Write an enzyme that holds these catalytic residues in place. Structure first.
Site, PDB file in Angstrom:
ATOM      1  N   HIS A  40       0.817  -1.233   0.000  1.00 58.70           N
ATOM      2  CA  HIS A  40       0.000   0.000   0.000  1.00 58.70           C
ATOM      3  C   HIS A  40       0.851   1.285   0.000  1.00 58.70           C
ATOM      4  O   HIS A  40       0.322   2.394  -0.088  1.00 58.70           O
ATOM      5  CB  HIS A  40      -1.061   0.000   1.128  1.00 58.70           C
ATOM      6  N   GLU A  52      19.660   6.442   6.770  1.00 61.00           N
ATOM      7  CA  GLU A  52      19.187   7.702   7.326  1.00 61.00           C
ATOM      8  C   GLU A  52      19.224   7.680   8.844  1.00 61.00           C
ATOM      9  O   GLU A  52      19.099   6.633   9.476  1.00 61.00           O
ATOM     10  CB  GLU A  52      17.746   7.948   6.909  1.00 61.00           C
ATOM     11  N   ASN A  54      18.616  11.251  10.533  1.00 63.27           N
ATOM     12  CA  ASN A  54      17.655  12.342  10.563  1.00 63.27           C
ATOM     13  C   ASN A  54      17.180  12.450   9.116  1.00 63.27           C
ATOM     14  O   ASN A  54      18.006  12.507   8.199  1.00 63.27           O
ATOM     15  CB  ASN A  54      18.325  13.648  11.008  1.00 63.27           C
ATOM     16  N   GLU A  62      24.112   9.237   3.503  1.00 66.50           N
ATOM     17  CA  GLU A  62      23.047   9.809   2.693  1.00 66.50           C
ATOM     18  C   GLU A  62      23.033   9.112   1.341  1.00 66.50           C
ATOM     19  O   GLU A  62      23.985   9.225   0.568  1.00 66.50           O
ATOM     20  CB  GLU A  62      23.281  11.311   2.510  1.00 66.50           C
ATOM     21  N   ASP A  84      -0.398  -7.456   1.962  1.00 70.18           N
ATOM     22  CA  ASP A  84       0.207  -6.131   1.899  1.00 70.18           C
ATOM     23  C   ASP A  84       1.735  -6.306   1.877  1.00 70.18           C
ATOM     24  O   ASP A  84       2.365  -6.252   2.922  1.00 70.18           O
ATOM     25  CB  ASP A  84      -0.214  -5.316   3.124  1.00 70.18           C
ATOM     26  N   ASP A 171       2.981   1.655  20.071  1.00 72.10           N
ATOM     27  CA  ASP A 171       2.495   1.078  18.804  1.00 72.10           C
ATOM     28  C   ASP A 171       3.075   1.891  17.660  1.00 72.10           C
ATOM     29  O   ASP A 171       3.574   2.994  17.887  1.00 72.10           O
ATOM     30  CB  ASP A 171       0.964   1.199  18.773  1.00 72.10           C
ATOM     31  N   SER A 172       3.039   1.326  16.448  1.00 71.70           N
ATOM     32  CA  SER A 172       3.526   1.977  15.216  1.00 71.70           C
ATOM     33  C   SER A 172       2.439   2.930  14.750  1.00 71.70           C
ATOM     34  O   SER A 172       1.284   2.779  15.108  1.00 71.70           O
ATOM     35  CB  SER A 172       3.852   0.946  14.122  1.00 71.70           C
ATOM     36  N   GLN A 174       1.033   6.142  11.598  1.00 67.04           N
ATOM     37  CA  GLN A 174       1.048   6.767  10.276  1.00 67.04           C
ATOM     38  C   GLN A 174       2.397   7.376   9.982  1.00 67.04           C
ATOM     39  O   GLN A 174       2.877   8.222  10.732  1.00 67.04           O
ATOM     40  CB  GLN A 174      -0.097   7.775  10.139  1.00 67.04           C
ATOM     41  N   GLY A 175       3.043   6.817   8.953  1.00 62.30           N
ATOM     42  CA  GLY A 175       4.376   7.208   8.544  1.00 62.30           C
ATOM     43  C   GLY A 175       5.296   6.023   8.767  1.00 62.30           C
ATOM     44  O   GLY A 175       6.425   6.022   8.312  1.00 62.30           O
ATOM     45  N   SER A 177       4.332   2.801   7.947  1.00 63.46           N
ATOM     46  CA  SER A 177       3.993   1.755   6.977  1.00 63.46           C
ATOM     47  C   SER A 177       5.211   1.239   6.232  1.00 63.46           C
ATOM     48  O   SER A 177       6.146   1.982   5.939  1.00 63.46           O
ATOM     49  CB  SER A 177       3.001   2.275   5.943  1.00 63.46           C
ATOM     50  N   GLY A 178       5.201  -0.052   5.947  1.00 62.11           N
ATOM     51  CA  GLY A 178       6.294  -0.647   5.212  1.00 62.11           C
ATOM     52  C   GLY A 178       7.537  -0.873   6.018  1.00 62.11           C
ATOM     53  O   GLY A 178       8.404  -1.589   5.567  1.00 62.11           O
TER      54      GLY A 178
END
Lengths: 223, 53
Positions: A40, A52, A54, A62, A84, A171-172, A174-175, A177-178
């Site tokens: 998704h 990464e 920051n 980088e 997914d 908990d995990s 939004q942001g 994902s994956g």
């Protein structure tokens, strides 16, 4: 990662940020050229940022690499979020080393109770948006398929597993994902979905990567 | 979206026996402008809004 701790330095080398103008997902480096992620999170022309610390300042490591092929699983259901899982092939192979390093694929699924490490740059606040600059980590156990199914009636498939704390607070989000869910050095799950974040009796749901090892292996060998 | 009891759930609504309600169910992506909302006020599970509300 709602209720987590800064990972600091570099202990999550296999972590990567999927950018499309801005950060929108995470992913795990399976080996120099491939990155596994949440189907998704698919977007046209994703750019992977590896090593990464920051996600705004050039913290030494980088690496922005464009994605050649973004192969989504052939049965991923955008509605149920079943299957997914998506594989990304980097235009150029990433530089493995002590900084950026690949995470291993599992050979057998984690039994409930297993303690894992979820990581990401997603929102930290339960109520309100506070997106961190640094990578956050969260130790969390794998809940029992039973407490999982009970929390999300029927919705929990055989390709999903719950992880976190039934009490809430960690908990995990939004942001995230994956992102990776590593248990004992193996990639066990991908941050997928859940109700809100850190909500009591609504644990984070994750993709059972162990069920997709074969597919992953075949896809890589042919592409 | 689904026929439900005396009513009919549209877009982002989940059917609760006889009434259509919104859900807090969401995938964990990072929408620049947040989740897309239907005419009823609900936000779609995993679809981002194209412009600030």
């Amino acid at each position: 990662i709602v209720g987590g701790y800064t990972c600091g330095a570099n202990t999550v080398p296999y972590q990567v940020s999927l950018n499309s103008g801005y950060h929108f997902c995470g992913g795990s480096l399976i080996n120099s050229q491939w990155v596994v992620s949440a189907a998704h999170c698919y977007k046209s022309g994703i750019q992977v940022r590896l090593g990464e610390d920051n996600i705004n300042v050039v913290e030494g490591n980088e690496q922005f690499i464009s994605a050649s092929k973004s192969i989504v699983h052939p049965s991923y259901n955008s509605n149920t979020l079943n299957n997914d899982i998506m594989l990304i092939k980097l235009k150029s192979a990433a530089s493995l080393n002590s900084r950026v390093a690949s995470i291993s694929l599992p050979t057998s699924c984690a039994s409930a109770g297993t303690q894992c490490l979820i990581s990401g740059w997603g929102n930290t606040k339960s109520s309100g948006t506070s997106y961190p600059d640094v990578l956050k980590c969260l130790k969390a156990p794998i809940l029992s398929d039973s407490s999982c199914k009970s929390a999300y009636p029927g919705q929990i498939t055989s390709n999903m597993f719950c992880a976190g704390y039934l009490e809430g607070g960690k908990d995990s989000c939004q942001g995230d994902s994956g992102g990776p869910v590593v248990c004992s050095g193996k990639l066990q799950g991908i941050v997928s979905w859940g109700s809100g974040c850190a909500q009591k009796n609504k644990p984070g749901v994750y993709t059972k990567v162990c069920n997709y090892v074969s597919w992953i292996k075949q896809t890589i060998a042919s592409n | 979206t689904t026929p439900c009891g005396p009513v009919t759930c549209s877009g982002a609504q989940m059917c609760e026996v006889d009434k259509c309600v919104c859900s807090d169910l969401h995938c964990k992506v990072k929408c620049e402008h947040g989740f897309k909302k239907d005419d009823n006020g609900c936000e779609y599970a995993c679809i981002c809004a194209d412009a600030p509300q």
